[PDB]
Amino acid sequence: ATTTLTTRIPTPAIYPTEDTEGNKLTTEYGYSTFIDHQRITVQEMPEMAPAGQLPRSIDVILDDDLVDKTKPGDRVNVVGVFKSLGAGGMNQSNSNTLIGFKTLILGNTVYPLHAARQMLTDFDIRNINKLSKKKDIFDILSQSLAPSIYGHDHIKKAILLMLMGGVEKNLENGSHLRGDINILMVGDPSTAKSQLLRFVLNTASLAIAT
Amino acid sequence: SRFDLLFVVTDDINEIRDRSISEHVLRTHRVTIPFLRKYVQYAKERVIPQLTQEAINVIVKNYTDLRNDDNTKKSPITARTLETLIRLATAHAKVRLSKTVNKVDAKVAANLLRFALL
Amino acid sequence: MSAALPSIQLPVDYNNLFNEITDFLVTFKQDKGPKYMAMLQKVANRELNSVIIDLDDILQYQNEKFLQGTQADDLVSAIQQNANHFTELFCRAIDNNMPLPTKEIDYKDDVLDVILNQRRLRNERMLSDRTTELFPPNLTRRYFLYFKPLSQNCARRYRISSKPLSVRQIKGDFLGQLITVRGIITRVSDVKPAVEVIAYTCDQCGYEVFQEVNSRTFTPLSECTSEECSQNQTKGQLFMSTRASKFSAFQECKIQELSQQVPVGHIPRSLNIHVNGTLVRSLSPGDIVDVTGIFLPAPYTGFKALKAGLLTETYLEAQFVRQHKKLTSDVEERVMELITSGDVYNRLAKSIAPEIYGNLDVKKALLLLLVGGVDKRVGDGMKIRGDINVCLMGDPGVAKSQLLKAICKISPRGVYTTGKGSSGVGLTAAVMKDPVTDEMILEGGALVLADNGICCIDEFDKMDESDRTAIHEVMEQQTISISKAGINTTLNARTSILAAANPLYGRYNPRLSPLDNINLPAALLSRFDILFLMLDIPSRDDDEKLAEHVTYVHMHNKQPDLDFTPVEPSKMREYIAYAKTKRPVMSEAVNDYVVQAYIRLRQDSKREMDSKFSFGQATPRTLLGIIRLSQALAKLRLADMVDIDDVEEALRLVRVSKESLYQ
Amino acid sequence: EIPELVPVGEMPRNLTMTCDRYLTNKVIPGTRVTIVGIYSIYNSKNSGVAIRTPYIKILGIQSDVETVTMFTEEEEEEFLQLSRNPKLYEILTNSIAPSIFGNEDIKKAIVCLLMGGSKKILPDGMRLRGDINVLLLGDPGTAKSQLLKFVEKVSPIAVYTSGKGSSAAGLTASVQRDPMTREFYLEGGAMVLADGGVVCIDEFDKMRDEDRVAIHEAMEQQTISIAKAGITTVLNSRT
Ligand SMILES: Nc1ncnc2c1ncn2[C@@H]1O[C@H](COP(=O)(O)OP(=O)(O)OP(=O)(O)O)[C@@H](O)[C@H]1O
Ligand SMILES: Nc1ncnc2c1ncn2[C@@H]1O[C@H](COP(=O)(O)OP(=O)(O)OP(=O)(O)O)[C@@H](O)[C@H]1O
Description:
- This is part of a larger assembly, with two copies of chain A, one copy of chain C (663 residues) and one copy of chain D (239 residues).
- In chain A, the strands form two sheets. A two-stranded antiparallel sheet of chain A has the order 1-2. A two-stranded antiparallel ribbon of chain A has the order 3-4.
- In chain A, helix 2 crosses helix 3.
- The two termini of chain A are 39 Å apart.
- By secondary structure, chain A is an alpha+beta fold.
- The radius of gyration of chain A is 28 Å and the shape is elongated.
- Chain A is built from four helices and five strands, in the order ββββαααβα.
- The longest helix of chain A is centred in the C-terminal third of the chain and has 12 residues, at 153-164.
- Chain C has helices spanning 15-22, 35-44, 56-63, 75-81, 88-94, 114-124, 332-341, 360-367, 401-408, 464-475, 540-555, 569-579, 589-608, 620-636, 644-657; strands at 53-54, 147-148, 178-184, 194-195, 200-201, 239-240, 247-248, 253-254, 272-274, 288-296, 315-321, 390-393, 415-416, 430-431, 442-443, 454-456, 480-481, 490-491, 496-501.
- The longest helix of chain D has 12 residues, at 104-115.
- By secondary structure, chain D is of the alpha+beta class.
- Chain D has five helices and nine strands.
- Chain D starts with 16 loop residues before the first strand and ends with a strand.
- Chains in contact: A-B, A-C, A-D, B-C, B-D.
- The interface between A and C is medium-sized, with 21 and 30 residues.
- Strand 5 (184-187) of chain A pairs parallel with strand 1 (6-9) of chain B.
- The structure holds adenosine-5'-triphosphate (2 copies).
- One adenosine-5'-triphosphate (ATP) binds next to loops of chain D.
- Chain A: This is DNA replication licensing factor MCM3.
- Chain A: It is found in: Nucleus.
- Chain A: Belongs to the MCM family.
- Chain A: ATP binds at residues 187-194.
């Protein structure tokens, strides 16, 4: 059930022995070909499904060409054929209230999307060096982040300082140190402590939080 | 002890402060974002300097005076806080996109902790 | 048969390789005569059962086929194409060129010797007892085969099949080949006898029916199939035989990944490996190793219709292991280096843990306990206390964990622990769940395996409902047991304890009362010997030096300085092990000097009687401990001088360990 | 079963039914409905003699309203004929609660609560919360209770969980083992049922356990994500 299209007569067999001769059959495994097989369930993008239900799911069988491409938590977009398989109603007798038509997708060519791959031209890569020549752009980025809230420029520079990230140089034959940065807030209520916490997730660059 | 920055958000009441607030929420019921996400994700692929004897000479002086002023005042600080004091300036040079740890980065690192502690 | 049963004509045959192993006779004269034939003689005389047929003897054999301009097909081509097919045509080449009666074994001095010849002559005389079944070739081997690839500059000479690929990229055309993979070995099973040959006896004809062994499930045959005991009105009823059935070795293991070449995404996964021949009993849990071996999948033969469509669940089959990273026996030259240079009290103090600032007092308090020694051979039933335990307290910011635990990962048999995981109930051994094999085994924690060593603990406020029992039961001598509903057996207890209790919130207030943050009064003031502290006082000159201390390690990557030559840890380990083989006996003037010491210890402790700073009220349990560490320091610095000055080193340490709080 | 028709001391029971495609997905949970169909019998082989089970084969749901905005035109004709008469704000306060003596300040707070404001997805990342949430605290015998049953029938979607919190951790989400494939998926909630409308609870003195820690995230941003053993998904909420 992998040729994706033609429902051939299956071969309910693993390995044959003794073809029409008196020779003990030998098998060359270097010239025997293989392929892989991986199922993955896809939820619903839980913003455009209207508020009357929990997210649903279906599943998709892909092949070797785009395995290990799918980290759990990626805005993926697949395209394939729609396909049913399995005997519903005859393989057991009396068959009462048992669906026997599994939904499958035997597909191809996934793409990550963004709403890691952003190729830029010579133009924008030069302009970003051209504005790098200014000696103020650390301050402009602080004020151009949260377009709703006054002040807190000590907080505002900290977020962009944390989000971009500091390195950790691992010790050779020694324990590396902390190279992560971990900031904290506290405040009396309704003072925008949770405001700026939700919009770091929109520009997160594949950093999905709980 | 495993965290570094404990920002305590104030909510003090000043008649010019809240008046400025009142219109700015009102003006929004009706330098760009995608350039910003490119700039940081380009700056995760540039080299890391770590190396200038000038910047490391000034910060330890900057530590020692507050090392006299942490214990007789508000909050005791530890040796791992120095690993912040390299790390903030280390990322601050990553904003600069350069391979020389300058002097100017060490001034914003000290001044940011000074509001965080005082 | 029709419908695409024949294949295309392939140019790669086997008969062209079959005669090329016939010219693996005595011809390789570059590497005292035929060297691979020389190894053939040291097996037939029955002392070793593993030949090694490398690629080096193939490439040099192909090196001197650079001048014979004839058609010789490639060898490392086909043996990486289908590697498993390169052992069965191999053994059918050795038998025509094996010199059999080259050994001398009379009656004994060989396992299974007179009886196989009894069996062979019972089949040889029954080869002409008509006035017939030949041996399958698997019966008379008594040997195995092995392989070994190359990753040396011969690969950079002229041309791959032995790059250390990870498990992650391996699912492609690498199935049915020979690939090596590095990893970390886990889940070591045992060694069980597998089957390779069979012998059914029917006790009428005695014709032992042989068969090849297939996969892990098979079936015996009938009794009316033979040549003599069959074909009549009476047939001998078959059953098995043990001693006439040669059995092999077998052991299963699982691999993981190095956790440094894993990508940022998914978790690593396992893989199955097997053993054959005699590479067995040569792996261990925790071996940072690599195996080279050949690849094949296996059928599942169970519930194959509804489930198990064409799933494969392969393993790899092992061929070679290249393990890595492992007393007056050519090591005495470095024992003399401590004897000639001397310098016990200070250079060895700078030797262990030179990566801190100050604190030579506490780095000296530990090296005496890393040698220990038998306290007193008591003879009678007086099991005396040994192996004193030192605890620490205080809250520095210099990451106190990697101060102590770095000592533990270089000290002998000293196992690391923490608060989570092996708690005080799972500190000893217990019975748990296991896989489908033998369940209810006695899985342990730390103290049933780290006997007579170092129990380096942290996080003393963690899981204390079980831990507070757990610390007393080892400070109490010899009651490490499992008092469960399974058994009531009790094992030994001989291990030192090194504790580091963290304070209460913020700093321990020294102006406040002590024991505000340790919760065990009865474990401390009567059943320990010495304490310390890591209190932080503001001091300008030290901290800027401490500032240069921590900043120096970043611009460079090296930390050493201050005119100390760094010492290898094996040297002091040999020095400890040699010092542990002395055990001097004290004189009389030493016990004369401690009775006056204890009186002067008694009088001043009986002056304060206050709850301000001090602890203890001069127990003899402190008196016996100060005898314990003295002979310990008399063990490491043995010049046979157990005297007043040796114990003057001892009280020198108890006065500086005490009153660490008075600053 | 509609929980009003057979009271003696019993607990209600339940049935099962299927349908065809051109009448499916026409119901949301939490509605009054009526239905007409057959009472045939199937026999599942996954209990005594050969016994079978009951189920309904439905035919047509001539329901009441949905309580997805398509309807006829003469409905809106009178509505526009009423909305031009500018007496709506004062005439509702008499006509909403025909059983309530006055209480003019409170009554106006309920009609604005039922309809709400809007929602801005304004061209940046963040958002405003377009909703209002009221409280009624006071002496017993001032009709704060029985006023709340009155908003339940008049709402499009309403639930009524007003008592004792009802295990406030299991108010928002629940996961359990499964009879088939032994899995951990999401099933239950009081909020996910009640989107677009209004919930109503009480007793905010003697719940201290989890009732406050369950509504802090559920309110003010209306974006929960369960981090239990399976999924971590940000399901929408506009409660
Ligand atoms: N300090 C502030 N400056 C400007 N606007 C603010 C501030 N605090 C709150 N707001 C406005 O209030 C709205 C919601 O604030 P928010 O709910 O994030 O408070 P909070 O950070 O969640 O506090 P808490 O977590 O204690 O509930 C935002 O739309 C924002 O415009
Ligand atoms: N302002 C009012 N107008 C009309 N009826 C009222 C009013 N206040 C109370 N009632 C009547 O009280 C009767 C019973 O209500 P009940 O005594 O249960 O109120 P309650 O629940 O005790 O008040 P509370 O919720 O403050 O405890 C109802 O039939 C209701 O008609």
